[PDB]
Amino acid sequence: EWYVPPEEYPKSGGVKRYLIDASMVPLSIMCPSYDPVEYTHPSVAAQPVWADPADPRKIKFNVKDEVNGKVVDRTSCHPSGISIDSNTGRPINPWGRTGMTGRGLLGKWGVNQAADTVVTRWKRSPDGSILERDGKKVLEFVAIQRQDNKMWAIPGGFVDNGEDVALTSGREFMEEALGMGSAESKDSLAALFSSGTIVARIYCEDPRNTDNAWVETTCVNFHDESGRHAARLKLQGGDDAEHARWMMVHGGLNLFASHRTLLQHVTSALNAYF
Amino acid sequence: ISFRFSLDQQA
Amino acid sequence: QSVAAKTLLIENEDGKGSTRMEVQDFMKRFHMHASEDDKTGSPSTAWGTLRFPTKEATAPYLRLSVNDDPEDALLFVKAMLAQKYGETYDRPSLILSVTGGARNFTLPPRLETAIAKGLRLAAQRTNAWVVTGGTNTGVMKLTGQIMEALSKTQSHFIPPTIGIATYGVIIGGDDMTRGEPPKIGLEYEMHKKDPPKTTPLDDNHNLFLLVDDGSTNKFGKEIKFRAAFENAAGQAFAAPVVTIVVQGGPGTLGTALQAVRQGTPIVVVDGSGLAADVLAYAYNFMHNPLTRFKSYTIDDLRQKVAQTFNPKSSQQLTNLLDSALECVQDPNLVVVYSLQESGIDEFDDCILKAIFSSQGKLGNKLKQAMYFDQLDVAKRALSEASKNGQHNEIAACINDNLMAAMMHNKPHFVELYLGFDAKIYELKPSEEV
Ligand SMILES: Nc1ncnc2c1ncn2[C@@H]1O[C@H](COP(=O)(O)OP(=O)(O)OC[C@H]2O[C@@H](O)[C@H](O)[C@@H]2O)[C@@H](O)[C@H]1O
């Protein structure tokens, strides 16, 4: 069931990883012929505010770490934990090899904590009856089409320092699904955001992941049981998303990264079809 | 049509 | 004793009038690929009219390359219509592309009569430009059989049944190549033997655009140009473009995928064959709320696709299934006509539902509803718009709709536009005096 990311790192100008077979992916297996290529993206190498420093020394992993007095999730959801390389001081990705050392397209060394906000509603006909498939009720979630690789995905982004999943989830949902942001619609949206459940905290199968930087996701589901609050949303794609739309949840979806596992967790929790 | 809805779809 | 045309009226880019210029000057801009790899090419010179047995009128043909601009081909069609039926010919208000199975099919008689009635009704009521392929087998032949009666019942204007086919598969291509550019009467021999090619042209299509890429006996090279030409024509006559899928193979699926991605609606006839049935299941699985469809799964679909297209690899099957699910993603762009759920005389209503589900402004949809003579549809749309606080758009489009209802002789629609607070003395001319 092991995930192996594609050879060419996204937005790197044709820079390619070190190709490995799917039976050599896990960290328990030895694999002595592992010779990754060290590549760091120009955006990451320019040192932004949301990017960790290029020298990972003096940073403590597997616990919540404070950068500029703000706490940032530096602990991974992997059961083994994060191992620290002795030679360079960089953390080592517990979710497997990716054929690439360095931080790559990811701004934070080790676990880059991302929060995804899956806002769901039951797919209903005008008559009001809930659509039913394979003996389970069918769900429907807001998915945005990404600007960079033109694949549909769940809205979300990296968790900022000093903030929780609640703020990150709400801010990302307002930014992506709603764009610019009243009166009653704001009250319905506030009622909608007041009830969120962390359904999973898993390792992302994101192609930008490397051996020293890997994406780990927290999934928060905002479900509208009645469907009143969801119907008041004016869907309009913004920021780094081109278009956003309501998509039906099923097992044959071709979505970005390991978002099928995240939906699977949402439908498993809600006893919905998948 | 009522009979069709009532029986055929019930099995 | 048909005198050859020496000059043609090509419409200006401003869209206000036609200028007369020589035929050889206009055609110089069409290129041909004999070298499968000559990318730029040489001038074509294979254009003219074909005479088919048992057909009184002759059909024009133009062989143009794949990289050529569809606007030039659109002028060519406009210039020929302008030459034959004068400058004030009936402009199309609907472009009905028809795409499906090339290989023969045996469709139920009731289904055939319903499709035949509806397509004919739509084209005649709206002088539509029907774009299909050019081969004589399958849908194209079926569409040709439907349009033969239109060519018989009408005396003064017949809507173009344009056939766009990939060159290199056409019987008599060597005969077509040999000769001079002003080629008016050419005998087409569909029964003539030709060694590498085996597909003859359908004799019932009124025009023909042979798309060439330099390959021989390779299909699917004209699909992209066909889609581009329909979109270009659609922008030019401000008319909606509606594709209808019948049976169909893998390239029809790709054609339908291209059509949704470009915003063009699709009407898929359930019960008509294979790929159409696949699309109908997929929709019924994804958006139909009736009780009898609740036992629908992806496994039975995937098994059906596997049985119909027969892909070499599992990943190919996954890609085809993913593409099929990507086609029906938007419920507005797909309308499924089925015999057991709809009426015999309701296929044009399905075409109108596709038009109403994809036309943005209220006025264009109301004009199309007038054309098809469906007052109830127009009445329901106006009442729904009136109830939902969209009164401003009603007032903005009511004058233009009333002006068309008067021009196209529809009194019943005239009463309706007036009943919705439209003052008769507040009419405005389309142009400025
Ligand atoms: N327009 C055509 N005419 C005749 N034969 C064709 C055509 N296109 C393909 N063929 C060949 O004839 C065989 C008939 O199979 P189909 O499944 O009918 O081919 P299909 O996949 O439907 O091809 C798509 C074609 O159909 C048209 O509606 C559309 O223009 C598209 O080019 C196929 O193996 C194909 O190689």
From TrEMBL, chain A:
Residues that bind Mg(2+) 8: E172, E175, D239
Residues that coordinate or bind Mg(2+) 9: E172, E176, D239, D240
Compartments where found: Cell membrane
Residues engaged in binding Mg(2+) 11: E176, D240
Residues reported to bind Ca(2+) 6: E172, E176, D240
Domain spans labelled Nudix hydrolase: 122-269
UniProt: Mg(2+) 7 binding residues: G156, E176, D240
Binding site for Mg(2+) 6: G156, E176
Residues given in the record as AMP binding sites: W50, G107, N112
Chain sites annotated for binding Ca(2+) 5: G156, E176, D240
Binding of Mg(2+) 10, residues: E176
The family this protein is said to belong to: Belongs to the transient receptor (TC 1.A.4) family. LTrpC subfamily. TRPM2 sub-subfamily.
Name recorded for this polypeptide: Nudt9 protein
Residues of the full protein shown: 1215 to 1494 of 1494
